[PDB]
Design a protein around this motif. Sequence first.
Motif, mmCIF file in Angstrom:
data_model
loop_
_atom_site.group_PDB
_atom_site.id
_atom_site.type_symbol
_atom_site.label_atom_id
_atom_site.label_comp_id
_atom_site.label_asym_id
_atom_site.label_seq_id
_atom_site.Cartn_x
_atom_site.Cartn_y
_atom_site.Cartn_z
ATOM 1 N N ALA A 105 0.849 -1.174 0.000
ATOM 2 C CA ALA A 105 0.000 0.000 0.000
ATOM 3 C C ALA A 105 0.894 1.237 0.000
ATOM 4 C CB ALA A 105 -0.928 -0.009 1.208
ATOM 5 N N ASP A 106 0.305 2.393 -0.274
ATOM 6 C CA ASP A 106 1.046 3.612 0.000
ATOM 7 C C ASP A 106 1.047 3.955 1.483
ATOM 8 O OD1 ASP A 106 -1.665 4.024 -1.537
ATOM 9 O OD2 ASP A 106 -1.587 5.581 0.006
ATOM 10 N N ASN A 107 1.772 5.024 1.814
ATOM 11 C CA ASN A 107 2.076 5.360 3.200
ATOM 12 C C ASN A 107 2.702 4.170 3.920
ATOM 13 O OD1 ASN A 107 2.380 6.960 5.425
ATOM 14 N ND2 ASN A 107 0.195 7.391 5.719
ATOM 15 N N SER A 108 3.425 3.332 3.176
ATOM 16 C CA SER A 108 4.121 2.185 3.741
ATOM 17 C C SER A 108 5.629 2.241 3.566
ATOM 18 C CB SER A 108 3.582 0.901 3.114
ATOM 19 O OG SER A 108 3.733 0.952 1.711
ATOM 20 N N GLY A 109 6.134 3.127 2.724
ATOM 21 C CA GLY A 109 7.559 3.291 2.568
ATOM 22 C C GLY A 109 8.205 2.593 1.400
ATOM 23 N N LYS A 110 7.449 2.214 0.369
ATOM 24 C CA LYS A 110 8.077 1.523 -0.749
ATOM 25 C C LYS A 110 9.089 2.445 -1.414
ATOM 26 C CE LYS A 110 4.389 0.373 -2.648
ATOM 27 N NZ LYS A 110 3.682 0.743 -1.408
ATOM 28 N N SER A 111 8.652 3.659 -1.743
ATOM 29 C CA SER A 111 9.527 4.610 -2.405
ATOM 30 C C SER A 111 10.667 4.984 -1.484
ATOM 31 C CB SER A 111 8.748 5.845 -2.827
ATOM 32 O OG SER A 111 7.880 6.247 -1.786
ATOM 33 N N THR A 112 10.417 4.992 -0.179
ATOM 34 C CA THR A 112 11.500 5.269 0.744
ATOM 35 C C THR A 112 12.511 4.139 0.740
ATOM 36 O OG1 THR A 112 10.133 6.626 2.196
ATOM 37 C CG2 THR A 112 12.055 5.546 3.164
ATOM 38 N N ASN B 123 7.025 -3.152 7.987
ATOM 39 C CA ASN B 123 7.786 -1.924 8.113
ATOM 40 C C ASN B 123 7.326 -1.100 9.312
ATOM 41 O OD1 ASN B 123 9.910 -0.496 7.134
ATOM 42 N ND2 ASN B 123 8.730 0.617 5.592
ATOM 43 N N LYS B 124 8.095 -0.052 9.617
ATOM 44 C CA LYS B 124 7.737 0.915 10.654
ATOM 45 C C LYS B 124 7.613 0.250 12.021
ATOM 46 C CE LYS B 124 5.128 3.722 7.363
ATOM 47 N NZ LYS B 124 3.801 4.330 7.076
ATOM 48 N N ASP C 243 9.566 0.831 14.600
ATOM 49 C CA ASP C 243 9.770 1.807 15.663
ATOM 50 C C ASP C 243 8.474 2.519 16.026
ATOM 51 O OD1 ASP C 243 9.507 3.062 13.295
ATOM 52 O OD2 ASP C 243 11.430 4.117 13.352
ATOM 53 N N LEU C 244 7.683 2.898 15.023
ATOM 54 C CA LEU C 244 6.388 3.504 15.309
ATOM 55 C C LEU C 244 5.464 2.504 15.981
ATOM 56 C CD1 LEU C 244 5.800 5.490 12.008
ATOM 57 C CD2 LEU C 244 7.407 5.915 13.860
ATOM 58 N N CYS D 94 12.662 -1.468 9.504
ATOM 59 C CA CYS D 94 12.419 -0.052 9.722
ATOM 60 C C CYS D 94 13.140 0.752 8.655
ATOM 61 C CB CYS D 94 12.889 0.400 11.107
ATOM 62 S SG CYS D 94 12.347 -0.636 12.473
ATOM 63 N N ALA D 95 12.795 2.038 8.578
ATOM 64 C CA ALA D 95 13.241 2.873 7.469
ATOM 65 C C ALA D 95 14.740 3.143 7.509
ATOM 66 C CB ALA D 95 12.486 4.199 7.471
HETATM 67 N N1 LIG Z 1 9.691 7.010 11.454
HETATM 68 C C1 LIG Z 1 9.532 6.186 10.427
HETATM 69 N N2 LIG Z 1 8.938 6.639 9.270
HETATM 70 C C2 LIG Z 1 8.768 5.811 8.217
HETATM 71 C C3 LIG Z 1 9.186 4.504 8.289
HETATM 72 N N3 LIG Z 1 8.902 3.911 7.118
HETATM 73 C C4 LIG Z 1 8.310 4.808 6.306
HETATM 74 N N4 LIG Z 1 8.228 5.991 6.975
HETATM 75 C C5 LIG Z 1 7.649 7.236 6.464
HETATM 76 O O1 LIG Z 1 6.531 6.942 5.657
HETATM 77 C C6 LIG Z 1 6.518 7.792 4.537
HETATM 78 C C7 LIG Z 1 5.819 7.104 3.384
HETATM 79 O O2 LIG Z 1 6.764 6.370 2.652
HETATM 80 P P1 LIG Z 1 6.999 6.738 1.115
HETATM 81 O O3 LIG Z 1 8.456 7.024 0.887
HETATM 82 O O4 LIG Z 1 6.146 7.911 0.725
HETATM 83 O O5 LIG Z 1 6.577 5.410 0.323
HETATM 84 P P2 LIG Z 1 5.040 4.950 0.274
HETATM 85 O O6 LIG Z 1 4.179 5.987 0.935
HETATM 86 O O7 LIG Z 1 4.847 3.607 0.925
HETATM 87 O O8 LIG Z 1 4.643 4.905 -1.278
HETATM 88 P P3 LIG Z 1 4.571 6.248 -2.148
HETATM 89 O O9 LIG Z 1 3.451 7.117 -1.638
HETATM 90 O O10 LIG Z 1 4.345 5.906 -3.600
HETATM 91 O O11 LIG Z 1 5.875 6.975 -1.976
HETATM 92 C C8 LIG Z 1 7.974 8.069 4.239
HETATM 93 O O12 LIG Z 1 8.128 9.389 3.786
HETATM 94 C C9 LIG Z 1 8.665 7.920 5.573
HETATM 95 O O13 LIG Z 1 8.965 9.192 6.091
HETATM 96 C C10 LIG Z 1 9.782 4.039 9.446
HETATM 97 O O14 LIG Z 1 10.157 2.872 9.507
HETATM 98 N N5 LIG Z 1 9.958 4.882 10.517
#
Ligand SMILES: Nc1nc2c(ncn2[C@@H]2O[C@H](COP(=O)(O)OP(=O)(O)OP(=O)(O)O)[C@@H](O)[C@H]2O)c(=O)[nH]1
Lengths: 128, 341, 235, 276, 57
Positions: free
Chosen positions: C37-44, C133-134, C136-137, C206-207
Amino acid sequence: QVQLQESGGGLVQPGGSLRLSCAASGFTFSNYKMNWVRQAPGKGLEWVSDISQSGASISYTGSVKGRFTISRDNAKNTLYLQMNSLKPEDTAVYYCARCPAPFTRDCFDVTSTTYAYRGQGTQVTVSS
Amino acid sequence: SGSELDQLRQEAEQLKNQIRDARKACADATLSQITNNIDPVGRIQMRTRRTLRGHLAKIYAMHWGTDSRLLVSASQDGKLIIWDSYTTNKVHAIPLRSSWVMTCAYAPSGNYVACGGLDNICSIYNLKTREGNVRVSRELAGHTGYLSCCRFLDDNQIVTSSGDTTCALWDIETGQQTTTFTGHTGDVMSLSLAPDTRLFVSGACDASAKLWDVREGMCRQTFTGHESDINAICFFPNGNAFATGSDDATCRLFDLRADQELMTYSHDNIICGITSVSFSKSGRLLLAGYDDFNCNVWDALKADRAGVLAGHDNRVSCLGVTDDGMAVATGSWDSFLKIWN
Amino acid sequence: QRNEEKAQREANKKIEKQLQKDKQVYRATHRLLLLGADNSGKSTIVKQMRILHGGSGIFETKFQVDKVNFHMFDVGGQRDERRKWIQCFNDVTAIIFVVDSSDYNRLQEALNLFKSIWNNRWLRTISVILFLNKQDLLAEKVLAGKSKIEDYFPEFARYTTPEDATPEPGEDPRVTRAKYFIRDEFLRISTASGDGRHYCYPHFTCAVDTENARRIFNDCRDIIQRMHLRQYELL
Amino acid sequence: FSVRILTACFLSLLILSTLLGNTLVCAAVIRFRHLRSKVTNFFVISLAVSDLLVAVLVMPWKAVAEIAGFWPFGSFCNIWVAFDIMCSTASILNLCVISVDRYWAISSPFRYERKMTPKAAFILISVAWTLSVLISFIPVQLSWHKANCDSSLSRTYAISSSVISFYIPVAIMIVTYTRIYRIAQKQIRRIAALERAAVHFKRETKVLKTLSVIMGVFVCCWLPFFILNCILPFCGCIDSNTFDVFVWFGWANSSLNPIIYAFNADFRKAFSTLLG
Amino acid sequence: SIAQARKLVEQLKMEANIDRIKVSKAAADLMAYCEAHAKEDPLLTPVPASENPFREK
Ligand SMILES: Nc1nc2c(ncn2[C@@H]2O[C@H](COP(=O)(O)OP(=O)(O)OP(=O)(O)O)[C@@H](O)[C@H]2O)c(=O)[nH]1
Ligand SMILES: NCCc1ccc(O)c(O)c1
């Protein structure tokens, strides 16, 4: 043209009961796995519960487990979501979505804006 | 009611029922009653006459040339190979930027090839470059979704279909979308230009097909009837009919002047979807590329299944008949275009 | 006209030898699809790989681990109906499914999407690498005790931490029970289908984790090992 | 006689079975190009050709000599014994190769998928066949193997060509397959861990069945013959009839090889669409 | 919501005033185009091996 008509659903006090009847027209009802997707006001689409091609295997979201039931009748070509003990957060429009492919167990039907094989909704409101 | 949305929903359903009545009004007879006295085609057993190898991944699109000799094939290894189908020789092997190509076309002048995919860009390549190597010539940008199909009209106009639910007519030189076609709710998966370039149809994932007027940018006709996603489309050679294949394991023939479905091609042993459809030169035979790795040749008049082309070991992803009708090619995800006749 | 047959033959020779070198390069590159899903960090995750290990919101990244090339791509510019372009990914080595374990209400969406991916007719043989993922949160929310998992998944009330769990040094048993509960919520679906054609490999990420390439390397290697085993009927 | 006609029909059936299995594999390979695509299939084809040669070259003449009782070909049989030593050694050799092949594709999948290119496949097949041809023909034409037509082998040549042709491949195959078993046990333990987590020795039996079938058919078919080649010329103890039936067991394995090395699903379907 | 509905309604109003022909005539045109082109379809009428570009030399 595939079209799904839902019915039922009105103002009902908390802890009440309702029964939403989704009648399908334009295909073979038995082949498609069916779901109930509700949308609460101000939030994206959320998926509630699914029933398989013949009512064999059913599954529910956690929040509605033990409260709602879902029955499929291929004879009358419909499915019913019988809700009981409604909470103030069960206020939502109730689309009755069908997954787009027969003879399978997967579907991707909670789409953000447009999915072509779910109905229009009967806004069920519950408050005191 | 008073709420203009409920009044528009009511008049919408009223219009949909006026359309269903005006459609059943001209539905006097059925194709089966009319075509019940013809003799069946019997058995059509074509055999692999060529096998075109070289592709390193699954083939996803193919297109005969106008000479009915050359053809371009797009594979998801990032390559676009041009074949001389008579001698199985490769004339060009064009590497692509985005490796996820999903469609490829062959300009009727033989001067250009096009292709696009998940990059949302339609790339034109000049085969007749002079000093050097065939390379990119134009590149059409603008779609917010994946480009699924494209076909040239001439050396300057090209139509594309995209997952942003729109089709577009482009002027390759200026790179501007000279015309936009909107109205589909789901992903447009395939388009087919009429033999006269004047109109074209598109099948989308909303279980609907739409006929579009190329020059005016308006949607002329919307056809329904399919139960699920439409995956392939091709005009009848006359231009007043077209066939669709969908995931519901059925082929349907629609007519333009009657504005309704004419015949449904199915068997109760066929459950898997449909990937490609195409008529023969005379339109009597309809070839379909099912998911069960075979291609069934149906008698387009009797709805009977007539022959099978069981030569692929994986899903048949695309197919195409030559413009002279001498042979049909089939591309599959096993990476082997095969010529049949 | 014999000149044109010889010109076609030598054009085929130059082509076939270019295609042979291209075959060897493409054959040695392990394509990896990033999904989730988005807001999951794939692009990160892709951003982190390009800056730590290297590469090319851009869709692709190309990186090498132990002389073995990988190409990880996340598709960003599409709509949300992933029901048709997903079939463009049937030959990938693995799908890296990333899930925001700290988003308690979009988590059911991730479970449904994982279930729909696992039972897809065209991805029946694509093994999935599960990134929870995430973390720590997630630990933040568990220690805060304001949003409890039981309100969304009541099974968690009767859930018992598995006896095979290996928590890292310094971790509250509530967080261990929460993250292993999400792990088993995805594993009960991935293992409910069976058939041995593909498997699911969960990992807590984690990120800021840097070793997230050695994990993908290890698990692509495990996927190939098990494919080669199940081919000779051993496993 | 009753016993004689029974031995005749049984030997003819054995020859026909060898021919059918190996020619079926060779035909399924030549006709279908989607089987020749991989590399392990290259090695299986090498094995099948070795076994078809065993049949067509070696078996019928020995069967005729066993039925008639006297060797009716005379000067041929020099060649014949050479043929035997070659063909019955390209088979064992090939098994070894295939085993090694499997090992590289389970113990090091990346290195395997990168380095094992058709050049290395052809070099390995060549090594097997050329080791065979050398060790068989070269000592025959120089009459080093000799210490109705005699087929006995000199005491030193017997042990030497035996050590190579059997005892190096069987050592390599046991080592390789026990390592492959260790790997499969690791993966089984891991999957079982995951599945028990989800739910909160069938796969072991499957591993054992397949490894046991392969290694045990090979051993129970060839090992007696080679312990005889070891013991017999030194103690020249047993008789010619017992030695002959234990010889025939080896070519029985050469008959069984198709069903044990070419029954992957695609091989099965290619056979089914070939024969009908 | 309202713009896609105005466009869907105007599309149905444009589509409503079309003139349709009887299916019997449309089928007669399909049968006519079929038998009118029957002699030039090699996949329907098999071509002699002399004129087959994929079997010749
Ligand atoms: N503190 C913390 N933040 C995280 C972690 N993983 C992801 N994030 C945050 O979640 C945000 C969403 O990740 P994105 O890089 O936008 O990737 P995505 O939302 O899953 O997919 P896209 O919207 O297409 O980019 C990122 O900007 C990170 O700041 C984590 O493990 N710890
Ligand atoms: N009939 C097999 C006889 C044989 C085969 C191979 C040998 O190396 C050997 O010494 C003897």
